[PDB]
Design a protein around this ligand. Structure first.
Ligand SMILES: CC[C@@H](C)N1c2ccccc2C(=O)N(C)c2cnc(Nc3ccc(C(=O)N4CCC(N5CCN(C)CC5)CC4)cc3OC)nc21
Length: 125
């Protein structure tokens, strides 16, 4: 099988806006994770063809990755910050679903998730 098309990063039917919380998610939260040592598996959609994972998209039907999130933020795709936080949590949960506890990539996702929640907590009022 082919790869699925990636998640949409624009949608002409979906109202858009920019907010201070969404700007923080791009300029601080995404930027911090993108530069982390463990970012690389998460910087683009899972290419199940290149990785020889014919079952990846049989198991994971809601894919998400930080390349998509970065484009959504840059495109002002979202209406609110909780939509973007949900995309990060989908990405982490997909990794935990497909893989097993203690696997290398699961420990990498757990480190990124810990840092993610720290950066969210730091959002100034
Ligand atoms: C361990 C689970 C890891 C495979 N993994 C998974 C494998 C099986 C099943 C599930 C997963 C999984 O859940 N996720 C999130 C993955 C997503 N994307 C990828 N993509 C990549 C894989 C290899 C390379 C790849 O061949 N390379 C060359 C050397 C580079 N290194 C970067 C860091 N520096 C220090 C050394 C060179 C980068 C790594 C590059 C990749 O995407 C860019 N892999 C995932």
């Amino acid at each position: 099988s082919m790869n699925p098309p990636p998640p949409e990063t624009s949608n002409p039917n979906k109202p858009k806006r920019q907010t201070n919380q969404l700007q923080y998610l791009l300029r601080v939260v995404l930027k911090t994770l993108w530069k982390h040592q463990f970012a690389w598996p998460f910087q683009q959609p899972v290419d199940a063809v290149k990785l020889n994972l014919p079952d990846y998209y049989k198991i994971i039907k809601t894919p998400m990755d930080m390349g998509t999130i970065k484009k959504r933020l840059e495109n002002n795709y979202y209406w609110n910050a909780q939509e973007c936080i949900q995309d990060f949590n989908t990405m982490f949960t997909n990794c935990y679903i497909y893989n097993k506890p203690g696997d290398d990539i699961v420990l990498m996702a757990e480190a990124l998730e810990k840092l993610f929640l720290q950066k969210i907590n730091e959002l100034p009022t």
